[PDB]
Write a protein that binds this ligand. Structure first.
Ligand code: SF4
Ligand code: SF4
Ligand code: SF4
Ligand code: SF4
Ligand code: SF4
Ligand code: FES
Lengths: 127, 161, 127, 384, 196, 180, 240
């Protein structure tokens, strides 16, 4: 597993992600959005784990309306997953306290935890 | 034209719809059997369609398994447009008493929820309260705790896509 | 008998006296404990005049120089006692009908109590 | 034509998915696909107190829930060696059978609707409503009632339950007959159900179809009889049977079961005198609420019981019970912890289903609906 | 009477016999003799195959021979030709690094779905099966959910102002290998049984 | 068996001409049994002191983990409950809640006791996590009910009636029977 | 090593062993209040009481397994009807004067008293007899309650079971006798004439106390023992 990005910094993270995906076709990939708090999307923060199936990618919590210009970044993220033909979007709910510890765990463990907790989600809510 | 833009005309159609609210049930667990009670007592609702095509109101009644989610997704998408979603019971609304790998911990993930109805199962009359809610919700007669008036159709608010 | 009731009423009485000596000298009074048979009494009925089981007079430092308590509503051989901390001093109040509140054969008047309390404060109270 | 009967539509009941391999109007083979209701109790329950689990037990077979309640309660009591009071046992047979009448009422309501027509769902619903009102009266809940306890049952029956059970016990004989009246003399239904739905006993046995859709094909096995538990050992008890397993016979057998159930209700109702209601062993049973205001030991045990709960011996255990869907039972592995090490639930509805590709093989298509309703599944039990 | 003929047979061939005084009885056959012996079991007159119950003993306080163990429930229906009512468990332990086991599908068609479930939830593959397809867990689910090393997968329950509960950090109840909240546990909380 | 078609019709006829069955909620109030499991209520002693000593044993008892209790110390001058301890926060997520009443059953002071209300359907998730001050014995209504009754100024009528209220609910006023 | 047998099992165990430890070492258990890791056993709370043999030759009266040395080829009995009866008895003596605070007590989920009581207590007398928790129907000991000993430490004198753990600790481990019992008989209680609770080590007694007599004021009334997310870590405040 690769880890790119840094916590709480939306535009740098988006530019880096755009760099890293490339001409990879995503039709068999699974997209996991890691967040705390089910109800309130307005003050939400978002981290992302992408399981391509041939390799995995982690981004910390740099996304969402929680940070300035963050909403537009999450929206373009999901739009971009959608363009490469990613379809299967999932939402994972962690304790705020977890979020820092979760991404400091080793790749395999973090990934199994994420797939265990993740809820199938409409890509449209992040647009 | 979505029921809109004459003060007389939109209100007229909006009653038309609220009182017409046409449930398309999507049974899952024991909650579905608790809605089959609702079928008895009912009086703007309980004619169906049953076929999704023909109905405005989608009632999610039961635990929605993760494997089951993409299905309910298309059923909702495969509904005509002026459409509403009621979420019935704890399992649907939140993760319920089953907090785990198996089950969607809020149905609002996959389909835009209009109205939520707690209970395990909720008494049927609560679901009447919810369709009266949604009745009076699409009349644009509905408010949250923050002071805000609530929109007739949620999923007029999500980006489709 | 129903002497029980007059006892609890008299217990309320003694508490009143403690509160007074407290304000008078500018020295702290404390309500220590309420009745389990009231707290944990749930729907169950409660007729007692107060809900209070244990109390004390503390000095500046909060260390008590005088202690006072009554039996729960449901206990055998009901008594109300007094104890002087550190001094090994124990007193047992009964109630004889028509006479009043007595320690054995000796009447327990308010005055007797105030004197005992002052001796207590001056001797035992640290500040 | 491999026709794809979907998950929830079109009226393939209880969220099943069916690949009817079918050219024409017959049925070649249906390739069944389940798992759409999988809630994962067997894992979740490894994370709940034995008390806490009693809230998760009714929730699988939600029609006959109390059979879950009964099976689980029993297997634990056995495992920790608890002694259930007679009046509690009697009440548990009453509730079990009443919940059975509820379940059955539902099964034939849906069955008659499923192919054939609408009307009789309603009368069954009326009697079921009287039953649910009984349950609300005693447990405060319609279903998923948190009542049964490893000792016994949560609390005693109110004044008003007895009078109301009689009312329904009065109308039901006339009532069950009225449903029977329409059915046994089946107008179209006879030419609709008599031929369809083939069940050889040998294959029922080969594929393991236990659940009262078994006796409709002429094998005589009832858990209340074969392996008696809660004192069914002591009742005047008729087990209805079928001749050659079709749709029709299954369908009537359960109706007979309803009057016999009612006869068990009356019988048990006769034998009921005042007393206590759960095993007083404090290890097993939380203290009386009144003395929480007096005893030290009470408070300690209250606090402890409702937080940690209790630890049964290290051991594995299982007890068989009869639901309106067949053999039910809890396989409980305890590690001596406050929560079960593992609970595998023997799901009658799950084994019963291996015989549907068999059952509806060669049958009609309109009938392929009826032949499903006739098998009486509950998916909460299946997926689970 | 058919049960006695099983136990008497197991004692001679050196098969261990488990018994709890609750009235439940096991017979553990080795891996080798399993397929054939059980073929003999259906042949022995065993009508009905009730269960296949998979067990993951990873977190069980005492050790057992191998990590996973499967239990079949064999019976002869009491209302049939000549039914005893003889029912009993046959247990077969299975290696962690070798989740193999022959199906009895040939024998009972009961073996069909149940063995598939035990494949889905635990990694155990059943030989000779008509179709081992994943049964229960979502199509794209990775792994085998009910085996102990696999997360129950809880989500926090949610309240008002930054307030959460993490169930697994909330749990009052202890498991078997749990210490408890004092220096140790003795007595009833190391396991208890009343004596009738 | 031709006769059946006929008799089938006959019984239905009998039933048509028999008029009665059903209750038209909310226009006719639903009858509930006295032990029914409704909206959680916190109860008070005669003194007015709250039964809740804030021990969060309701929460530990909870299989859905839907009860959050932040605890607190009583003020000698002006007390809340009968011990030295009471409940600073009591939240219940109705959406998380399964409605066992293991909370009530665990409750040592008879503080937490499930009520009678069912008309709680509401539009927003977080409006559905009830707090203490929505649950006390004095309160009449559910959240959307009360909110409608303020935005209208038209008082709350619950859609239920009971023969009487349980001993454990003591203080909880409800529309009963013809007791009124 | 000295060869000991506890109940159904045998153990190697070095000579100066406490019988209690040889017990637990065999994987058994026995009530434990006064004795503490790193503290002098003194058979005080008398909870740890077991049986000892030395040849079948049973000793007349029970050994406190905490204060009994182990001898070569010695037997130790912890599950006998008579032992469990005695254990239950000492527990009942301890519970005899106690306050009734569990719901409202900060010692909450993890109380050596609570857990020992629920483990060993109420021995099985011989049916569904309706039995009594409590024999004693008289008035309990009532003293000073909720008394701050220092900005960091709170005292309930009612809860104290008069094990020696806190005073013992103060004299033995830090070496500041800022705590000791006062009067005698049942009247005995913890107090201090050194008011601050001066020692910079004072807060450990909060951990040691088998009950909630001594509690940690900085964390008073915050959450119940189970309810905390507990993060094991190491303290970076100094080099140790
Ligand atoms: S909320 Fe309760 S009644 Fe509804 S599906 Fe879930 S368990 Fe069944
Ligand atoms: S009723 Fe049950 S789920 Fe609801 S708060 Fe009480 S214990 Fe928890
Ligand atoms: S409601 Fe009852 S159980 Fe819950 S904290 Fe209050 S007193 Fe304790
Ligand atoms: S010291 Fe222990 S037994 Fe006593 S009130 Fe506190 S928790 Fe309960
Ligand atoms: S205060 Fe606690 S540690 Fe000290 S003697 Fe009393 S019970 Fe033992
Ligand atoms: S533990 Fe040995 S006497 Fe206290």
């Amino acid at each position: 597993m690769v880890r790119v990005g840094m916590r709480a910094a939306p535009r740098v993270s988006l530019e880096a992600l755009k760099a890293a995906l490339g001409g990879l076709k995503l039709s068999e990939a699974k997209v996991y959005l890691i967040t705390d708090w089910q109800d309130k999307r307005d003050q939400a923060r978002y981290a992302l784990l992408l399981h391509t199936g041939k390799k995995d990618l982690l981004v910390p919590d740099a996304f969402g309306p929680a940070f300035p210009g963050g909403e537009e970044a999450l929206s373009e993220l999901v739009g971009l997953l959608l363009a490469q033909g990613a379809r299967r979007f999932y939402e994972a709910v962690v304790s705020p306290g977890e979020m820092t510890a979760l991404l400091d765990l080793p790749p395999e463990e973090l990934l199994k935890r994420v797939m265990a907790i993740a809820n199938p989600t409409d890509p449209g809510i992040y647009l | 034209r979505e029921g809109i833009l004459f003060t007389t005309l939109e209100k007229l159609v909006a009653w038309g719809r609220s009182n017409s609210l046409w449930p398309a049930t999507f049974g899952l667990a024991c909650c579905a059997i608790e809605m089959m009670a609702s079928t008895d007592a009912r009086n703007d609702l309980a004619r169906f369609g049953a076929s999704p095509r023909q109905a405005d109101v989608m009632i999610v009644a039961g635990r929605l398994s993760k494997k089951m989610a993409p299905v309910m997704r298309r059923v909702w998408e495969q509904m005509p447009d002026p459409k509403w979603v009621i979420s019935m019971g704890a399992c649907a609304s939140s993760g319920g008493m089953f907090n785990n790998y198996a089950i969607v911990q809020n149905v609002d993930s996959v389909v835009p929820v209009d109205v939520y109805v707690p209970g395990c199962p909720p008494r049927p009359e609560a679901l009447i309260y919810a369709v009266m809610q949604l009745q009076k919700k699409v009349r644009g007669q509905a408010y949250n705790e923050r002071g805000e008036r609530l929109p007739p159709v949620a999923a007029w608010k999500r980006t489709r896509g | 008998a129903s002497s029980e009731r007059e006892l609890y009423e008299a217990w309320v009485e003694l508490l009143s006296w403690m509160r007074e000596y407290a304000q008078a000298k500018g020295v702290r009074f404390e309500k220590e404990a309420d009745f389990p048979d009231f707290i944990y009494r749930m729907e169950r009925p409660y007729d007692l005049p107060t809900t209070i089981m244990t109390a004390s007079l503390s000095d500046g430092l909060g260390e008590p120089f005088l202690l006072a308590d009554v039996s729960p509503r449901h206990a055998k051989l009901k008594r109300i006692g007094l104890r002087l901390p550190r001094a090994h001093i124990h007193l047992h109040a009964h109630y004889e009908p028509g006479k009043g509140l007595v320690t054995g054969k000796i009447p327990l008047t308010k005055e007797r109590f105030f004197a005992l309390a002052d001796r207590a404060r001056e001797a035992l109270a640290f500040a | 034509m491999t026709l794809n009967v979907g998950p929830q539509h079109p009226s393939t009941h209880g969220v099943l998915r069916l690949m009817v391999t079918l050219s024409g109007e017959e049925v070649l083979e249906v390739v069944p696909h389940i798992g759409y209701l999988h809630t994962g109790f067997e894992k979740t329950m490894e994370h709940r107190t034995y008390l806490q689990n009693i809230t998760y037990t009714p929730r699988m077979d939600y029609l006959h829930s109390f059979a879950h309640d009964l099976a689980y309660a029993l297997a634990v009591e056995k495992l920790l060696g608890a002694v259930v009071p007679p009046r509690a046992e009697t009440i548990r047979v009453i509730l079990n059978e009443l919940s059975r009448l509820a379940s059955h009422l539902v099964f034939l309501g849906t069955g008659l609707l499923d192919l054939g027509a609408l009307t009789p769902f309603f009368y069954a619903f009326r009697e079921r409503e009287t039953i649910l009102d009984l349950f609300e009266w005693v447990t405060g809940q319609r279903f998923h009632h948190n009542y049964i306890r490893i000792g016994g049952v949560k609390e005693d029956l109110p004044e008003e339950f007895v009078p109301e059970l009689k009312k329904l016990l009065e109308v039901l004989p006339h009532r069950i007959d009225e449903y029977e009246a329409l059915f046994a003399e089946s107008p179209i239904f006879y030419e609709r159900a008599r031929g369809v739905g083939v069940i050889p006993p040998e294959v029922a046995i080969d594929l393991g179809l236990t659940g009262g859709s078994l006796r409709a094909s002429g094998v005589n096995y009832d858990v209340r009889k074969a392996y008696p538990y809660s004192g069914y050992e002591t009742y005047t008890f008729d087990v209805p049977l079928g001749e050659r397993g079709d749709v029709f016979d299954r369908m009537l057998v359960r109706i007979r079961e309803m009057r016999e159930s009612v006869k068990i209700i009356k019988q048990a109702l006769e034998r009921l005198e005042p007393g206590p209601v759960r095993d007083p062993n404090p290890q097993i049973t939380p203290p009386p609420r009144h003395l929480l205001e007096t005893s030290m030991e009470a408070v300690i045990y209250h606090f402890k019981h409702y937080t940690e709960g209790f630890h049964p011996p290290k051991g594995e255990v299982y007890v068989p019970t009869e639901s309106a869907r067949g053999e039910l039972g809890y396989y409980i592995v305890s590690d001596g912890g406050s929560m079960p090490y593992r609970v595998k639930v023997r799901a009658p509805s799950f084994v019963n289903l291996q015989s549907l590709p068999y059952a509806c093989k060669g049958e009609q298509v309109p009938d392929m609906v009826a032949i499903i309703a006739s098998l009486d599944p509950v998916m909460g039990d299946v997926d689970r | 009477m058919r049960l006695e003929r099983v136990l008497e047979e197991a004692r001679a061939k050196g098969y261990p016999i488990e018994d709890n005084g609750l009235g439940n009885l096991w017979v553990v056959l080795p891996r080798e003799r399993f397929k054939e012996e059980m073929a003999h079991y259906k042949a022995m007159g065993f009508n009905f195959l009730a269960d296949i119950v998979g067990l993951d003993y990873l977190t069980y306080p005492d050790p057992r021979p191998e990590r996973f163990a499967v239990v079949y429930e064999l019976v002869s229906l009491p209302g049939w030709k000549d039914g005893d009512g003889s029912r009993f468990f046959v247990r077969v332990y299975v290696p962690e690094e070798d989740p193999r086991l022959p199906t009895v599908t040939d024998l009972w068609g009961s073996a069909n779905f149940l063995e598939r479930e035990v494949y889905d939830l635990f990694g155990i593959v059943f030989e000779g099966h008509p179709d081992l397809r994943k049964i229960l867990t979502p199509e794209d689910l990775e792994g085998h959910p009910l085996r102990k090393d696999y997360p129950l997968g809880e989500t926090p329950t949610l309240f008002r102002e930054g307030r959460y509960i993490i169930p697994a950090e909330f749990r009052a109840a202890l498991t078997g290998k749990d210490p408890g909240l004092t220096f140790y546990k003795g007595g009833s909380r190391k396991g208890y049984r009343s004596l009738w | 068996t031709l006769k059946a078609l006929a008799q089938s019709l006959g019984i239905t006829l009998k039933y048509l001409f028999s008029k009665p069955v059903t209750v038209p909620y909310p226009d006719a109030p639903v009858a509930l049994k006295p032990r029914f499991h409704g909206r959680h209520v916190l109860t008070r002693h005669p003194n007015g002191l709250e039964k809740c000593i804030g021990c969060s044993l309701c929460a530990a008892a909870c299989p859905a983990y839907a009860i959050y209790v932040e605890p607190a110390e009583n003020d000698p001058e002006n007390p809340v409950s009968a011990g030295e301890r009471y409940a600073k926060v009591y939240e219940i997520n109705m959406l998380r809640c399964i409605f066992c009443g293991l909370c009530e059953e665990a409750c040592p002071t008879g503080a937490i006791v499930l009520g009678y209300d069912f008309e709680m359907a509401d539009y927003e998730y977080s409006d559905l996590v009830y707090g203490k001050e929505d649950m006390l014995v004095d309160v009449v209504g559910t959240k959307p009910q009360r909110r409608e009754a303020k935005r209208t100024g038209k008082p709350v009528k619950v859609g239920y009636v009971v023969p009487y209220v349980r001993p454990e609910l003591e203080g909880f006023k409800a529309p009963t029977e013809g007791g009124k | 090593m000295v060869r000991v047998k506890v109940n159904d099992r045998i153990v190697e165990v070095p000579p100066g062993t406490s019988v209690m430890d040889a017990v637990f070492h065999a994987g058994y258990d026995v009530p434990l209040f006064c004795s503490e890791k790193h503290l002098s056993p003194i058979g005080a709370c008398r909870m740890c009481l077991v049986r000892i043999g030395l040849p079948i030759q049973w000793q007349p009266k029970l050994a406190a397994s905490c204060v009994t040395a182990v001898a070569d080829g010695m037997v130790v009995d912890t599950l006998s009807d008579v032992v469990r009866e005695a254990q239950a008895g000492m527990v009942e003596f301890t519970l005899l004067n106690h306050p009734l605070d569990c719901p409202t007590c900060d010692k909450g989920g993890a109380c050596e008293l609570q857990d020992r009581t629920v483990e060993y207590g109420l021995y099985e007398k011989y049916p569904l007899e309706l039995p009594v928790y409590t024999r004693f129907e008289f008035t309990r000991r009532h003293v000073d309650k909720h008394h701050p000993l220092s900005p960091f430490v709170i005292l309930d004198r009612e809860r104290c079971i008069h094990c020696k753990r806190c005073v013992r600790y103060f004299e033995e481990v830090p070496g500041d006798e800022v705590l000791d019992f006062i009067e005698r008989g049942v009247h005995t209680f913890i107090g201090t004439m050194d008011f601050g609770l001066p020692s910079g080590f004072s807060g450990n007694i909060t951990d040691i106390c088998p009950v909630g007599a001594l509690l940690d004021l900085t964390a008073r009334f915050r959450a119940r023992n189970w309810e905390m997310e507990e993060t094991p870590t190491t303290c970076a405040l100094c080099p140790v």
